[PDB]
Design a protein around this ligand. Structure first.
Ligand SMILES: [Mg+2]
Ligand SMILES: [Mg+2]
Lengths: 593, 595
């Protein structure tokens, strides 16, 4: 996994994470505010490179350009962005002579670019898929390029490609180069804050609970009855959970089914790679982002199994309001309210405006600009709207549906502006002069996912979960705040139970209790010495884990040792020191008075 | 790193005593009952401390000891025996249900040391027609009832897992798994004349046929091949070795008794099969099984009668190779040309001295055995060195050691080797000694161990000295013509040493630092290891890790020593051309070929 553009010989700047984010917060839905961030970005590239390098494109912080090591794209400069920046997690090659060029726009469904026979060097299943970027190539010439997903089935004899969904010019290279940018997988399917704000069942907050998430190293300690001291700080292992969990697959069109040699699918109906539902059962389909109207959740019928693994098949017409396409979108399927779900199906009228004045961007920098600008406005509308629902619910009221539609319209023009220069719709931002429950959730659940990504350091995670103490100081729904109190209690006992249980004494103890280390190579003696004498124990410990050092040879390095020991070795030494299993302690804290 | 002892996979604990109070404790040991009982004493007293009791089940060899304790599988056989099963590296593991096995009866049925004839088993043997030297156990829980030591072979024509029941140790009762540990993986073995070999059966004037060569480990070999400067090979002594006029063939040693079980016909008396086309059916070859014994009885003429059905192997009759001492429990068989065709070993025509039925009792414990082993290991060495030493005093006048005496040394050796399992009564032996600088004394310096292929790593300071020993030949008493013949070789060695004496690597390493472009961007963990090494002066350890974890070269260019180890053939050639180095191999050639 390094980037597709690099393998095509492209330059790669990586501007400071912070320098764009500051520049952004001067962004408004105005032509000027664009030309603003446009100007400021121009002279951010110039004060790093000296010049405006020909054919440059950018995402956030990342900028990219060919130089002349860089393979040439036979397509508008700004389009090229979609192709270069993605990781190349796996590669393959096909001679242009093997391909059937099935013709038609959106033949396979709008997003799917190839229906192939098994290809186990990009898709790990016969029944599989991969999200890809694919080019038809000369030597340094790239004539046509496809972005989207390809599927794979035994019944498929010859590789088929949706030619008219390509990007370059008519003529075609002599080899088709395919880069898997995302390997086949299911996706974790949990309710989100946005989702719950926009379409949650009445009193949905009532159904949130605390849970524990241990990475496999730590989960081994927990399973063997490691003392709670070894889990400090317990906050880094906390997460919220919903009353239940969804299914999440890549999203495919029924248009593929004929080419798989299979019959199609009724209107109002869904297939997915799971037996969790019986054919005929209703389910809630969801595609993200959740939009303020609540329109990202629709009720559809589970009609049976998908023939492609890790996928949901649904008609374009059935999921149109949710904004779904087939070029990498994930479909999530949740239980309906009646059978315990937290998302309510959308029943309102949806379909927003047909067209606004639209120019392309003038270059790829123009695009990068628009992108950066738009991204801010997106967040603005998002947060503002959520805040407004806070004030509204506080004041016994509700945000009028017309306004949610207006917000929704801004959000999706924002998303479209990652692509083309589109005129913003008119939209008043109300602004709130109070701390609202939304502000709490941005603290407690940054990004809205109940699954955190534990980059945030030990220092800060405890503060995050300590925020649960300050509910009263936030304005929002009376019943939300009051309903959330038992959960804040639970959080609180768990935190308190671990507050002063530090690991250092247990690490010291294990050093004394464990026997002297068995004989080990001098390269190991030497690494461990190197680590200790310089304060890089952790790098060394990571190395020895990777190089596969055995536990018996690590007993003078308790932290290392804990990472190599077996279940039996851990159990044994914990018994010796007579530690109370952390989980027993944690359960008691959860259940307590 | 992974590869760990079968014992430790079984739950057994382990200690390593220093190489000091083993080479110290033993080095006062005599062919007497009491010399044993005082090596046993100071051992049982050396496990006294460094541990609590003397743990029960305890076994050992040299400076290493192991015991079951809390876990550790419990073996349903004599404690002392178990030594032979728990000590070896488990290089690969496999499991068969006890209902899959067919059990063939009679001792030595597949030949003495072969324990299984099996269908292809790709978990332990790479070749469909392969082998592996194994310990296998029949298992319950921590219950190990019966265990086999020896070789298993593998052939497509074997349909059912065939196993030599009555060769195993323990009780007739059988667990439900058969657990197999491959302790040596199918390989050919490197086949070269040894010093002891040439002392004991060397062609007349054999020393005349030794020469200088280079052995570069792959890392250095990459360098040399890309024309690294001689500076980067310092000290060149660590790459020197002696070489024969020719090389042998070396394979695992199997009994023709296996052939019926592969659906094949057996083998004529006096014949060998081997996995090589280097000989034609008809041709004579010298068969050699180590250790080379003083009688000369470890080399015997046999006829090559065709291919072995099994890869990397030699097949010959217990019958025909029994003077050599060989059986099949992992014994290697070596096959060299006959004298007529350039061989340096001479075939033995004589009576083999293999005395039978002198008082034999067991060891009582397994610490007894350990004691026995350490005790014996020394007596063995002294006899072996003593006997070679006398050959020097003798050829020095113009005499021979009396063949009778060679016979007695041999029988002494054989008992040493046997005393490693059982408490066997020592033979009467006379240690007629010389004290003088003898040529054996030199060989033990220039070629420690006897084997022309040096033992891996000895400190770089000392290795230059060892090859310097060739200066001091005259200091040494023995065969005139040996001493005199070797002069051009002692010269060759000396030219080569001198060609590289003061070409140190420091300067070249500093140049590569400057010549190479700035390192590409590297993960923090890489940055961290590199500073760790730097700050503590342990960079070589750090480099070993990064090599092992597979860092790319473009990221290591500030650490030339590391860089040299990651770089491609093309990348090396390139910087060497830039710095204008003269290829080392050219200079090394010149040093060889000069008047
Ligand atoms: Mg999309
Ligand atoms: Mg043997």
């Amino acid at each position: 996994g390094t980037r597709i553009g690099t393998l095509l010989g492209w330059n790669l700047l990586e501007f400071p994470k912070e320098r764009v984010r500051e520049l952004q917060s001067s962004a408004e839905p105005t032509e000027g505010s664009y030309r603003n961030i446009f100007d400021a970005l121009a002279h951010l590239v110039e004060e790093a490179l000296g010049h405006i390098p020909h054919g440059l494109i950018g995402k956030d912080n990342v900028v990219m350009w060919p130089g002349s090591t860089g393979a040439n794209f036979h397509l508008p400069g700004w389009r090229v962005s979609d192709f270069v920046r993605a990781p190349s997690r796996a590669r393959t090659e096909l001679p242009t002579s093997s391909l059937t060029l099935v013709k038609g726009k959106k033949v396979f469904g709008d997003g799917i670019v190839g229906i192939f026979p098994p290809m186990p060097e990009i898709v790990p299943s016969p029944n599989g898929w991969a999200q890809v970027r694919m080019f038809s190539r000369r030597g340094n010439e790239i004539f046509r390029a496809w972005k989207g997903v390809i599927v794979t089935h035994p019944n498929v004899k010859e590789p088929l490609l949706a030619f008219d969904d390509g990007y370059g010019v008519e003529e075609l290279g002599d080899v088709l180069e395919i880069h898997a940018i995302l390997l086949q997988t299911q996706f974790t399917a949990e309710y989100t804050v946005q989702g719950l704000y926009y379409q949650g069942i009445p009193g949905w907050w009532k159904h949130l609970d605390l849970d524990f998430a241990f990475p496999p190293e730590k989960s081994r300690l927990v399973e063997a009855g490691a003392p709670l001291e070894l889990l400090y700080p317990i906050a880094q292992y906390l997460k919220l959970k919903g009353p239940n969990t969804g299914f999440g697959g890549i999203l495919l069109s029924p248009k593929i089914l004929p080419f798989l040699g299979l019959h199609g699918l009724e209107d109002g109906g869904v297939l997915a790679y799971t037996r969790r539902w019986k054919p005929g059962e209703r389910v809630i389909f969801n595609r993200r982002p959740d939009l303020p109207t609540g329109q990202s959740a629709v009720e559809l019928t589970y009609v049976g199994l998908s023939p492609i693994a890790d996928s949901v098949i649904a008609h374009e017409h059935d999921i149109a309001p949710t904004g779904a396409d087939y070029d990498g979108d994930i479909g999530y399927v949740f239980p309906t309210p009646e059978m315990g779900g937290l998302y309510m199906p959308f029943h309102g009228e949806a379909l927003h405006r047909k067209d606004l004045p639209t120019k392309d961007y003038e270059s790829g920098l123009h695009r990068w600009a628009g992108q950066v600008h738009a991204a801010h406005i997106l967040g603005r509308v998002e947060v503002n709207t959520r805040r407004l629902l806070d004030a509204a619910w506080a004041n016994g009221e509700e945000v009028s549906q017309d306004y949610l539609h207006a917000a929704t319209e801004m959000i999706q023009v924002a998303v479209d502006r990652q692509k083309r220069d589109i005129q913003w719709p008119d939209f008043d931002f109300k602004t709130i002069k109070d701390p609202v429950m939304t502000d709490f959730w941005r603290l407690a659940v940054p990004g809205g996912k109940l699954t955190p990504e534990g980059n945030t350091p030990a220092a800060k995670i405890t503060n995050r979960w300590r925020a649960w103490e300050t509910l009263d100081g936030y304005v929002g729904h009376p019943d939300m705040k009051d309903g959330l109190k038992p959960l804040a209690s639970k959080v609180s006992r768990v935190l308190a139970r671990g507050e002063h249980r530090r690991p250092g004494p247990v690490l010291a103890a294990l050093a004394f209790a464990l026997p002297a280390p068995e004989p080990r190579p001098k390269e190991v003696e030497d690494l461990l010495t190197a680590g200790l004498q310089s304060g890089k124990r952790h790098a060394v410990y990571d190395a020895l884990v990777q190089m596969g050092l055995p536990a018996s040879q690590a007993t003078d390095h308790p932290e290392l040792w804990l990472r190599l020991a077996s279940k039996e070795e851990l159990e044994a030494v914990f018994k010796q020191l007579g530690y109370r299993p952390a989980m027993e302690e944690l359960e008691e804290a959860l259940n307590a008075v």
